[PDB]
């Protein structure tokens, strides 16, 4: 019901210090499962989740070879891009790619993705129809014409609709014990006196998966979107996530405040109070 697989490629040039470094990581939903680093002594795609370890030698060989080829191709791309933008050889530049599939509850492709960024900016992206491109500038229009000639869109559509979804569903089955078992947040509210006028109420959500979550404070039933401090969702380091929301209240009015937590692992939305 709305699962995804994503690969994230990053190449960074280092003029005068050898060839660009290529890094790849792969995710199923919010779980990283593979990595690759071209700087490694004998670069191999490596497992990063328990459920992928079972794949055989041929799986690792094939993906390692693709990663090694991509390393070289990215070096070609960086050189080409440098030329498109009339840039010198002295600067470090970055090429990023993300691609993958979202699968629906019926097991079919819901949406395919394939996009690139140069130096942190949108460069070119495969449209939702998986048959046309969106080029960000005149440089990216050169790339588009090369990729139209090479019928890249057609090849990517094939992967996204077939291979990509097939592997995602395989991973989902093999790792279903962890991937298809949402872990609801452990929640609690803390109270921190600032002075005699007021104090901070902080609502915690810990050890949840997946990352998607909603934390809000309410006074008498009205949201405090304007006076709520809401930190970015962060990794716990064990494959679960954390988040908190805080609000400043006048001493004696803590009563009027309730914290509301929504997460797919929860049977029902929680409302906490101090």
């Amino acid at each position: 019901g709305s699962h995804s697989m994503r690969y994230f490629y990053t190449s960074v040039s280092r003029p005068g210090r050898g060839e660009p470094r290529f890094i790849s990581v792969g995710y199923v939903d919010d779980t990283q499962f593979v990595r690759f680093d071209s700087d490694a002594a004998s670069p191999r795609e490596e497992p990063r989740a328990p459920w992928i370890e079972q794949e055989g030698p041929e799986y690792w060989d094939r993906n390692t070879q693709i990663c090694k080829t991509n390393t070289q191709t990215d070096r070609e791309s960086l050189r080409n891009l440098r030329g498109y933008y009339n840039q010198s050889e002295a600067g470090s530049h970055t090429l990023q790619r993300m691609y993958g599939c979202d699968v629906g509850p019926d097991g079919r492709l819901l949406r395919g993705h394939n996009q690139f960024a140069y130096d942190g900016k949108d460069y070119i992206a495969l449209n939702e129809d998986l048959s046309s491109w969106t080029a960000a500038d005149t440089a990216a229009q050169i790339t588009q014409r090369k990729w139209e000639a090479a019928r890249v869109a057609e090849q990517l559509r094939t992967y996204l609709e077939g291979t990509c979804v097939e592997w995602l569903r395989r991973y989902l089955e093999n790792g279903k014990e962890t991937l298809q078992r949402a872990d609801p947040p452990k929640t609690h509210v803390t109270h921190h006196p600032i002075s005699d006028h007021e104090a901070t109420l902080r609502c915690w959500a810990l050890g949840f998966y997946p990352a998607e979550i909603t934390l809000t404070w309410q006074r008498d039933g009205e949201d405090q979107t304007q006076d709520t401090e809401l930190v970015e969702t962060r990794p716990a380091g064990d494959r679960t996530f954390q988040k908190w929301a805080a609000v400043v209240v006048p001493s004696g009015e803590e009563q009027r405040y309730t914290c509301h937590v929504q997460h797919e692992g929860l049977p029902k939305p929680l409302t906490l109070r101090w």
């Binding site: 799986y59 993906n63 990663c67 991509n70 791309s77 080409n80 090479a150």
Partner: peptide, 9 residues
């Protein structure tokens, strides 16, 4: 698994 298609920009 990674896409086996390869095209320089």
């Amino acid at each position: 698994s990674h896409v086996a298609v390869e095209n320089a920009l």
